[PDB]
Amino acid sequence: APPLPAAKVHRVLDAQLGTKWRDRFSSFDDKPVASASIGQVHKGIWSDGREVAVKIQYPGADEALRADLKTIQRLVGVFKQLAPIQGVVDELTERTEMELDYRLEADNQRAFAKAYRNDPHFAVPAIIASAPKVVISEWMEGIPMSVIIREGTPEQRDLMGTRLTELTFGAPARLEMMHGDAHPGNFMLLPDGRMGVIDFGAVAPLPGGFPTSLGETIRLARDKNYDELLPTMERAGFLQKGQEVSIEEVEDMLRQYVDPIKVDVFHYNRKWLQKSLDLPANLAIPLRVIASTVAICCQLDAHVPVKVIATELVPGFAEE
């Protein structure tokens, strides 16, 4: 059965937070608001009156999944033999092992919470208590990004896209991290106009922030300055030296990043959307997160001033 019994919930809270956990609450609702992913979320009222979310993991989930990962690795071994993409295996081992210890995502969320405290554009729920199998955070509600994808005014969609773009370009500058690969479930629209970010399970660390070579590359690509574009690309890791590349192939490569900054306000959309081999990680991560944000923006059909935000936040993009 999907919902875990109250006794087991109390057992988890006892094992993780102690037998006196109830003293930290003004109230605690023993029936789960959500209950799917090897565990469930409860709503409660903390001692100071703040509404709180309490994520609690199923007791047997840990070892079960730990065995299952080894299992899937082999089975695909057999598959590798049978028909020569296992990156999927790496990828979901990586995403799954995050859930074995909530403290990881909790720490990422802490980082973003301090970095974006009292920010006029972003809202991050504060981590109140953290344990391997239990994590308590501030309850935060607003219009989910999925809802805004399906319905809602163009103004709202443009706002969400703008917020996500600002998050993508601005995160590595504020703290040496990126929010990572996201889906619209991670975001919501608060009444005051801020974007709420409530999932940090795929946060990517990025020491030093964006390499200036990115902004340089996109800028020079827009300016058609090939003679200075190519060396900056070879320096960025975009290209290898001694590589026969056609100029189109370059354009083909960079249009995904250059087209939105050709104009003052670019209209992200699905239709436009339709159209790493020894890379350095400090280049590979930005491209992937940016791709994520672009996909979401196209889902939002958002009109985003990417040129201004880049110019302000992306190193090396501003005119020299």
Numbering used by the authors: 98 to 181, 185 to 375, 393 to 437
Pull verbatim passages from the article behind this deposition.
Here, we show that MSMEG_1954, which has 79% sequence identity with MABP-1, is responsible for macrolide antibiotic resistance in M. smegmatis. Similar to MABP-1, MSMEG_1954-form 1 and MSMEG_1954-form 2 are both composed of two domains, the kinase-like domain with a phosphate-binding loop (P-loop), and the N terminal accessory domain that consists of six α-helices: α1–α4 helices (residues 1–114) and α6–α7 helices (residues 158–199). As demonstrated in MABP-1, MSMEG_1954 also has ATPase activity with a kcat of 0.00864 s–1 and Km of 0.231 mM, values that are comparable to that for MABP-1 (kcat = 0.0137 s–1, Km = 0.285 mM). The structural studies verified that MSMEG_1954 can assume two different conformations, the closed state (MSMEG_1954-form 1) and the open state (MSMEG_1954_form 2 and MSMEG_1954-ADP).
No electron density for the N-terminal 97 residues (α1-α3 helices) in MSMEG_1954-form 2 was detected. The SDS-PAGE results of form 2 crystals showed four bands, suggesting that the missing N-terminal 97 residues in MSMEG_1954-form 2 were probably degraded during crystallization. However, the N terminal accessory domain in MSMEG_1954-form 1 and MSMEG_1954-form 2 have different conformations. In contrast, the remaining α6 and α7 helices of the N terminal accessory domain in MSMEG_1954-form 2 are positioned far away from the kinase-like domain, in a way similar to MABP-1, which leave the substrate binding pocket open. Structural superimposition shows that the MSMEG_1954-form 2 and MSMEG_1954-ADP complex have similar conformation to that observed for MABP-1 and MABP-1-erythromicin complex structure. For MSMEG_1954-form 2, the degradation of N terminal 97 residues may decrease the steric hindrance, which release the compact arrangement of N terminal accessory domain. It is likely to represent a transitional state between MSMEG_1954-form 1 and MSMEG_1954-ADP complex structure.
